[PDB]
Amino acid sequence: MQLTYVLILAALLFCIGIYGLVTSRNAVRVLMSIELLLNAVNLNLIGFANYLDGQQIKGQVFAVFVITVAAAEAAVGLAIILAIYRNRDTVDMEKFNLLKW
Amino acid sequence: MDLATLTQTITFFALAAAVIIAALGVVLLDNVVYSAFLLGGVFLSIAGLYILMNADFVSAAQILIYVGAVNVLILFAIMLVNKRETYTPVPGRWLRQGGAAVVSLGVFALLTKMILQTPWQLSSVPPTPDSITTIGQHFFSDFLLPFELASVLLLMALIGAVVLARRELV
Amino acid sequence: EVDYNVVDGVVNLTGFVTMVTGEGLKYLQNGRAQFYALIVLLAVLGFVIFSVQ
Amino acid sequence: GQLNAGTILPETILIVTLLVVLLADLIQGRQADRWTPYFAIVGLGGAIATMIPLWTQPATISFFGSFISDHLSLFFRGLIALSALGTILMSIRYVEQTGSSLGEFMTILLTATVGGMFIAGAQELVFIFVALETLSIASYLLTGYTKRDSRSNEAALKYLLIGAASSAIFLYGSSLLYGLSGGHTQLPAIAQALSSESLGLVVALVFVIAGISFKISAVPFHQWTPDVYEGAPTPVVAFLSVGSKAAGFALAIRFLTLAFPSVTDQWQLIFTVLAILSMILGNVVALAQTSMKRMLAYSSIGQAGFVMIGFVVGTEAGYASMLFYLLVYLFMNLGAFTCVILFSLRTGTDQISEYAGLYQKDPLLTLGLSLCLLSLGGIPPLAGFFGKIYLFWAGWQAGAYGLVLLGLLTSVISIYYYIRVVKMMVVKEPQEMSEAVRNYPEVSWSSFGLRPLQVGLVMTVIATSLAGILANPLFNLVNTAVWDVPQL
Amino acid sequence: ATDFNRGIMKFDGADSPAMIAISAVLILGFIAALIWWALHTAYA
Amino acid sequence: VFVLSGYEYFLGFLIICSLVPVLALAASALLRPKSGRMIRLTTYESGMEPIGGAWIQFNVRYYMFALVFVIFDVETVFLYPWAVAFHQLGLLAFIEALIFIAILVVALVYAWRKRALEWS
């Protein structure tokens, strides 16, 4: 058994990203947690492409696309963080409670 | 476990402990620059993990993008928003943190149950060492439409991130 | 007095107890994004738990 | 399979239109904004016009197992293209009035359109992900486009947070589907490689359902929608309520009928709970909203519950009722958002109380917003009555009595908060009119983009009123897009 | 309630909640008694 | 099964190349003045006290250069498997990669024309 260890490590990385997506006060640490989530998914994909689909490695192509889309999504997320930092001069997530009920 | 599979298991457990420890340091650290450097530590240990499971081009892509470009961008934006904010702890911190911990532990217990419970269809054929040639054959095959759509995604992401991170002094 | 009070009380009470559940169900959407993702993940957990018995 | 690149000609025309609009605003600058909206309109019309020869073709799975050009994907591609066409007709004066550039806005909007139109037919798991995050990232960029406003920046940040979390949950579901089916990424190959319910398939199902219901705005995942529709530009939220929701429903029909035709009772129970509590919380929280955009957000959640009534039934008429309701919902919601645009351009306000007394100042705006909001409420001669009639006819057919009863009850609740806006515009006295309507400008359709606004308003109002009684060609166009759904 | 207590219909303690409650149970109880009696005494 | 060849030296050379700054700094710290009962801890500031507040200016050029680096870095990592698997692919893959390169050339023209490649 070695694929299940890669999957359990990817699940632990996903839950470490979850605790931190919904915990962190800094808005950039939320994007760091989002990158942790995406790298957990990529660990699942590369492990599945290794232990199940080693000849046609479609999970590695999937992980290349996830890496390349997650790069652009982190880029536009830091753009949105800088745009919200320009007006309100904090980055604290507890000061972005303006669009309530 | 003579010497090769022993080295592979020792490397896997060392890199897994490095991912776990550095990812906890990304979350559970007060200094945000330490999280922004331990994120690169996470990405490097994950690239070593990809090296272990026969994905060398994807590991080099992981070093080139996540360490080389995404972490550098994150560090640049961290230096851009670097201040000395107080971050006064709100009185309802239990409702966020304890709920977040029990949700993360519930998702981890559920995922561990379905991972250890599922009969995965393990292959006996060894994988191909020539990964980048089959990925290049895949990019102009089955995966051609995402390959062309990724260019439009990158163009739109560059357009929007130039627009939103700009000053329009006119 | 019975007609104006009791029967119109049932009618206006039907129209009233559907107004205070939305003046008190809007506080479920409270402006915090991390609470919203917590609700999303609790929904994921609850739908897995209820979809398997 | 074999590559069939003649399928992508709507999206190819729209990608070329995107590139021409961007290159024109790079060459000419802001003075390129005088003709490039009309070029984007002609490009979207050309995409819809090239969809017409594709409608008379077979199923013709296009790329190497990566795209389906059947009538269902063609219907959804035409729906998303019409949503973007109405959005471009609304965002000519509104984007120029904020001082922003119109060409970069239109290229991000056309990128969202090609992302939705690629969602509309998609078999690869990675093509589903790439098109879904093309639409998602373009929606985050369109949400905070007016970056001098704090509400748009906050809406973009909390939209990117929820969307990235839902994207990673969707990707964990897609990675689990890649692992559970051996090594397959196409949805029919996943359907063939797994055919029995197990712990792990239910996990991938609920993860994918969360990532999809983020786009649907079902009730535990609805919470981005009121903040985004209060914060973002109003044509962006018109596109997000029509075209993004249509892309999410295209993803749901493409995914749950192809990748999961084995746990159909499980995701039908899940979407039953989503529909029930989505109708409830969408139609009773809009009673207390005092802004028109937030009321339209909660009403959009209620309309998503009404569509999920027909989605959860699982028959041919149920999918047809969902398609017809999305088709008429395009007309009524684009007309309502066109009137919200045309009132906020002249008054600068959004509150429902500030609409008071509009009947004598701007009669066309009150006729438009009255007809579209009453069509959203389910008033007989308009289109939404017939859409709800089909949604309840298909839903009493396959024994879903409680969902049809809840849909009728929440439509009665919906009538109150729609008729409140109609009461503000029509019923309120001249001596009781608001400060925005007292200082109302002269009605002039000649400034920069108010004539495309009037053209889009007249077209959507004529559609949402006349196309309820002329619905039989729409019924015929919809019911042939249901034969391409498995198990019917 | 005060708009009904004028002129000919003018009685002290008519819109009181005790009087409204006893008149409500009297009226609506005779309604329910007549309905149950019609379902029982009348055939078809 | 680990089938990659050449990475049994990569781990050992990573270990030894990580130890060579560690051994250099440890051999420095062994033979060194352990000294300084007064202030080692001073900032430079060109010969005197810290002048003018301990801050730098927010400048978004640091974001814009790393952003265009992210975009064209992703472009190059997509272009690597096209490049090495070019001898096994015909004119059609060259046309498809030409479409990819042309869309990101339009992205470079946008990054040039809008003032995002600027001074630093």
Numbering used by the authors:
A (entry chain E): 1 to 101
B (entry chain G): 1 to 170
C (entry chain F): 603 to 655
D (entry chain B): 8 to 495
E (entry chain Q): 2 to 45
F (entry chain C): 13 to 132
Quote the authors verbatim:
In both cyanobacteria and plants, a type-I NAD(P)H dehydrogenase-like (NDH-1) complex is crucial for CEF and respiration. The NDH-1 complexes belong to the NAD(P)H:Quinone oxidoreductase family that includes the complex I (NADH dehydrogenase) of the respiratory chain in bacteria and mitochondria. The electron delivered from Fd is eventually transferred to PQ which is bound within the NDH complex. To further advance our understanding of NDH functionality, we solved two single particle cryo-electron microscopy (cryo-EM) structures of NDH-1L from T. elongatus BP-1.
We first solved the structure of NDH-1L complex purified from T. elongatus BP-1 at an overall resolution of 3 Å. Interestingly, we found that the NDH-1L complex binds a PQ molecule at a pocket above the membrane plane. We assume that this is an endogenous PQ molecule, which was trapped in the cyanobacterial NDH-1L complex during purification, as was earlier reported for Escherichia coli complex I40. Thus, we named this structure as NDH-PQ. Similar to the two previously reported cyanobacterial NDH-1L structures, our NDH-PQ structure also contains 18 subunits, without any signs of association with NdhV. In addition, we found that the NdhS subunit in the NDH-PQ structure exhibits weak cryo-EM density, suggesting that NdhS is also loosely associated. In the NDH-PQ structure, we modeled a PQ molecule in a pocket (PQ chamber) at the interface of the membrane and hydrophilic arms. The smaller PQ chamber is caused by the different conformation adopted by the β1-2 loop of NdhH, which intrudes into the PQ chamber, and the side chain of M22 blocks the path between PQ and the N2 cluster. Indeed, the H23-D124 hydrogen bond is preserved in our NDH-PQ structure; however, the PQ molecule is more distantly located from the N2 cluster, without direct linking with NdhH-Y72 and NdhH-H23, implying that our structure represents a state of NDH/complex I that is not fully active. The occluded feature of the PQ chamber, together with the long distance between PQ and the N2 cluster, implies that our structure represents an idle state of the NDH complex, as was previously suggested for the Yl complex I39.
